[PDB]
Design a protein around this ligand. Structure first.
Ligand SMILES: Nc1nc2c(ncn2[C@@H]2O[C@H](COP(=O)(O)OP(=O)(O)NP(=O)(O)O)[C@@H](O)[C@H]2O)c(=O)[nH]1
Ligand SMILES: [Mg+2]
Length: 403
């Protein structure tokens, strides 16, 4: 079918520690809203964690995109992995978010990736956060629930989110999900668990503002994934950052390659629905003519031809995490070669310290030069994260492009 715009569109998603309930909540959101809006397509647990490797490991590995809507807005929701081995996919998912739903297990409280996800969500531009305290069906001590809530707000404050003001809904994604299976038509007010899901939706509706979109700037879309649609071609997916794109437009594939590739857009879809035009904010699949899935990849960006120039060298202001925040135990030197994350791009870079600065310690606030091993679309003021050896080691901002 063709996508019909009738209400504002917002991109949300789920982040949080492994096993805290992100995928269960995601499925519940689709079932709950579907009872009220026939246009919503239901997605059960196994329809989201559907890949063979996910069934093999028993965890989410790939980001999943599901759609649902309330009376007020239309939502694209990205469900991310909580396992530490897949932090890379979580970052790519967060880069598509206008707001995030932080899931925390009431039974376990804040764990290492609860903190790491909050820190990373910020560095990729997530402005707002709503908390769903999950698994309360397992905690009878009210004091504990109040304690976890306090801990979570404290954590958010540590990373510059308004911890004291964020809505914190307490519920059970699983019990809400079970109820909807028993009665798919369950409406608001009928069941306790389902009502808590409605509470979350109301908070999303009202707390996360609809972003100001720039549909008049040159088209720019960070690529999050790429695949082949047999008999149709190569599709690049991602959230349009600014501008618009129409079937027939020419776009440039920028970054990660020595040279830039140009091709024509032959299709645009949002959630398998046809669009004549994709605009800033939409989460879409863009069909590209004449390129194979080995010619486009995650981390590159599609852009209006000639509007972007990929760079490799820049100066940056950086905060280096302390051991206590999951950071490094020891300092590093000039020549350190960690991974840098900008939006959906992940690239190796070489740290070059200025003379007189020969070492950087955890907890330090420094400025230094970074030289990337591959060209990528960059801009001054662009935030980024630094990871190395399975941990996030720093967060920074690009202050000046050098080349
Ligand atoms: N008791 C209880 N268990 C729950 C609840 N929500 C989820 N679970 C369970 O806890 C486990 C993890 O749930 P899941 O949704 O896959 O977690 P996730 O946060 O998406 N994990 P990952 O980080 O791999 O993506 C499952 O066994 C699931 O049934 C809940 O409200 N109550
Ligand atoms: Mg999951």
């Amino acid at each position: 079918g063709e996508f019909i715009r009738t209400k504002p569109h917002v991109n949300v998603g789920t982040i949080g520690h492994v096993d805290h309930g992100k995928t269960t909540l995601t499925a519940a959101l689709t079932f709950v809203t579907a009872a009220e809006n026939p246009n919503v397509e239901v997605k059960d647990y196994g329809d989201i964690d559907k890949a063979p490797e996910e069934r093999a490991r028993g965890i989410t590995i790939n980001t999943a995109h599901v759609e649902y809507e309330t009376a007020k807005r239309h939502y694209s929701h990205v469900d991310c992995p909580g396992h530490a081995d897949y932090i890379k996919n979580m970052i790519t998912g967060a880069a598509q978010m206008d707001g995030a739903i932080l899931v925390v297990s009431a039974a376990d409280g804040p764990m290492p990736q609860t903190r790491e996800h909050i820190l990373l969500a910020r560095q990729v531009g997530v402005p707002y956060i709503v908390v769903f305290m999950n698994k309360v069906d397992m905690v009878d001590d009210p004091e504990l629930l109040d304690l976890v809530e306090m801990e979570v707000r404290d954590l958010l404050n540590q990373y510059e989110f308004p911890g004291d003001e964020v809505p914190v809904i307490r519920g059970s994604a699983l019990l809400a999900l079970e109820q909807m299976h028993r009665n798919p038509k369950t409406r608001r007010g009928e069941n306790e668990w389902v009502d808590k899901i409605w509470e979350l939706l109301d908070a999303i509706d009202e707390y996360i503002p609809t972003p100001v979109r720039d549909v008049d700037k040159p088209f720019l879309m960070p690529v999050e994934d790429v695949f082949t649609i047999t008999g149709r071609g190569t599709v690049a997916t991602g959230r349009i950052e600014r501008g618009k794109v129409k079937v027939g437009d020419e776009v440039e594939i920028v970054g990660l390659a020595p040279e830039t590739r140009k091709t024509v857009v032959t299709g645009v879809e949002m959630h398998r629905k046809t669009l004549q035009e994709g605009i800033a904010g939409d989460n879409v699949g863009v069909l590209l003519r004449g390129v194979s899935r080995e010619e486009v990849e995650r981390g590159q960006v599609l852009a209006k031809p000639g509007s972007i120039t990929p760079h490799t060298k820049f100066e940056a202001s950086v905060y280096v995490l302390k051991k206590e925040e999951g950071g490094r135990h020891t300092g590093f030197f000039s020549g350190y070669r960690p991974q840098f994350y900008f939006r959906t791009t992940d690239v190796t870079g070489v740290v070059q310290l200025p003379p007189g600065v020969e070492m950087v310690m955890p907890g330090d606030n420094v400025t230094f030069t970074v030289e990337l091993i591959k060209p990528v679309a960059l801009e001054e003021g662009l935030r980024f994260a630094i990871r190395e050896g399975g941990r996030t080691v720093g967060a920074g901002v690009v202050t000046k492009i050098l080349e």
